[PDB]
Amino acid sequence: KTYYMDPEGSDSNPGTSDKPFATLVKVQEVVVAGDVVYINPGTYVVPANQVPMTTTNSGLYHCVFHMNKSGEAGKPISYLANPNKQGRPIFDLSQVKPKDQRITVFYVTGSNLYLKGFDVIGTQVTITGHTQSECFRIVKGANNNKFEDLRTHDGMAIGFYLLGGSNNHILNCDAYNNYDSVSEGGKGGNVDGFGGHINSSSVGEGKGTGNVFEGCRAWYNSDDGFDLINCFEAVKIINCWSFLNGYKPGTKEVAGDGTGFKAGGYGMAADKLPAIPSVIPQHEVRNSLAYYNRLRGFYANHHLGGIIFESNTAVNSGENYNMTNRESPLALPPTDVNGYDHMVKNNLSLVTRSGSKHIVMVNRAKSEVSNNSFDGSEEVIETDFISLEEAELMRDRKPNGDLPDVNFGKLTTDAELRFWGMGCF
Ligand SMILES: C[C@@H]1O[C@@H](O[C@@H]2[C@H](O)[C@@H](O)[C@@H](O[C@@H]3[C@H](O)[C@@H](O)[C@H](C)O[C@H]3O)O[C@@H]2C(=O)O)[C@H](O)[C@H](O)[C@H]1O
Ligand SMILES: [Ca+2]
Ligand SMILES: [Ca+2]
């Protein structure tokens, strides 16, 4: 079956093209494996009083849409912007403010799902202590899903937040202009674009493995663009752009941590040891771009082992590459050391911003550090690039959702010969 929804539809309708549904709550009542839902473009304001589809964590979370049904292998359930209509569906969550609860807009427990082509805006935070909300929260048991050309923006919530699940592909998604102005004095320190945090409950082959962020952009998230702390299976970030994170949206006002790619770690607590996986995962950041994050570009974040940083480009992102690891095995007090077991290869780094640096805190005897611009005999300069115009990075995606063509961060023909094989382009 192909069902339809529309902002001016009705949940008393049958869900046909002529008589569409109004909400995903009704969609969820009827769909089965192999069904397709075409979501007509327009603005869907979620009513303030719409009851949550579920709650989690002893009532802490109000979950707007519970993506609880599953497809089968070869027969997904697909929730797609209607490809026969121009424009995008935009779910506006600005009225949803349940007292004393965190918000999850799409709480994903099902498997074999395909979600494409729509936006989630205005997601709220009302709690004033330590808190967060998420546009997408994916957990243990949610396997073999695809999230494509989705945009989580102009709200107070983390865009994508993985606590578990396997083979979740987050492809060509944007998370931008996300800032929690409400909690903890409006620091914004828990709002990332994309978070990979496969927890202890979700470990194992086919249980927490295989999740990938690909082709995604994160900008003006108040904390980090991408963050893989406390992530018990390897997560990969491939062909992603992370820029202008750590600032309040549209400004250079200081907010949170400002990392482009925070690519590991299990914390640096002084009081107690963190839980850790049995095998420290080798997360990866490859063919990616960091530009003008407030503090750091590509960061090992006190990892307890090796990360792969391959074929990336950093421009004016503070510490463009920082390989700091925590000393292993775990001990107290916690100790930072030069990064060990990393692969740092074929990277490019430009510095013309005051206080920015190429690479810090790498152990070259324990990490493979090869063919990076910062270890060559010539400095990388601005005119080695075709363009460094920031606006290019915010250009509209192509109609199919692919990243826009840009010259930003692309070496000229002449420079490419002097920095051969280096950088994300
Ligand atoms: C619902 C809570 O879940 C757990 O706490 C998580 C997380 O395990 C903690 O490490 C910590 O994480 C913070 C941020 O909240 C998180 O977004 C970021 C990626 O890492 C740390 O900065 O708090 C989390 C949280 O959700 O509050 C624990 O099981 C808590 O007891 C539980 O309330
Ligand atoms: Ca933070
Ligand atoms: Ca973060």
- Our measurement of the distance from residue 193's CA atom to the centroid of its chain's CA atoms, rounded to an integer in Å, reads 4
Sign of CA dihedral 103, 178, 201, 71: positive
Half-sphere exposure of 291 (CA within 13 A, CB side): 22
- Residue 261 alpha carbon to ligand 3 centre in Å: 9
Choice from 107, 190, 266 to test ligand 1 binding pocket (greatest atom count within 8 A of CB): 190
For this entry, resolution in Å reads: 1.1
Strands 336-337, 325-326: pairing is antiparallel
| Bridge partners (DSSP) listed for residue 44 | 91
> Of the candidates 344, 336, 351, which has an alpha carbon nearest to the alpha carbon of residue 385?
351
DSSP for residue 99: T
Going by C-alpha positions, the residue among 239, 424, 405, 295 that lies closest to residue 349 is 424
Q: Is the CB of 190 under 6 A from ligand 1?
A: yes
Task: Give the whole-angstrom CA distance, residue 166 versus residue 208.
Answer: 4
User: Look-up: residue for tokens 């324990």?
Assistant: 366
Closest by Cα among 273, 283, 368 to 329: 273
Residue 354 CA to residue 356 CA, distance in Å, equals 6
Task: Tell me, in angstroms, the distance from the centre of ligand 2 to residue 201's CA.
Answer: 23
> Tokens 């250079």, residue?
252
- Ligand 1: distance of its center to the CA of 266 in Å? 12
Nearest Cα residue to atom 20 of ligand 1:
229
Give 247 Cα–ligand 1 centroid separation in angstroms.
22
Annotate 22-40 with three-state secondary structure.
CCHHHHHHHCCCCCEEEEC
Put residue 29 in one of left, alpha, beta given phi > 0 → left and psi -120 to 50 → alpha.
Answer: alpha
Residue of 185, 373, 194, 221 whose CA lies nearest to 294:
221
Residues in CB range of 291: below 8 A, 6 or more apart: 241, 242, 243, 244, 260, 314, 315, 316, 317, 390, 393, 408, 409
Ligand 1: nearest atom to the Cα of 229: 19
Among protein residues, the one with the nearest Cα to ligand 1's atom 2 is: 57
Q: How far apart are CA 43 and CA 175, in angstroms?
A: 18
Rounded to 5 degrees, φ, ψ at 208 are: -135, 5
Q: How far apart are the C-alpha atoms of 138 and 321, rounded to whole Å?
A: 29
Peptide bond into 89 cis (omega under 30): no
- In angstroms, the first-to-last Cα distance of the chain is 42
Read out DSSP for 170-188?
EES-EEEEE---SGGGG--
Contact indicator for 245, 259 with CB cutoff of 8 Å = yes
Closest residue by Cα to atom 18, ligand 1, is 190
CA distances (Å), origin 243, targets 99, 288, 292: 33, 11, 6
Look up residue 117 and give its amino acid: G
Backbone angles phi, psi at 202, to 5 degrees: -110, 20
Q: Give the DSSP H/E element, type plus range, for residue 313.
A: strand 313-315
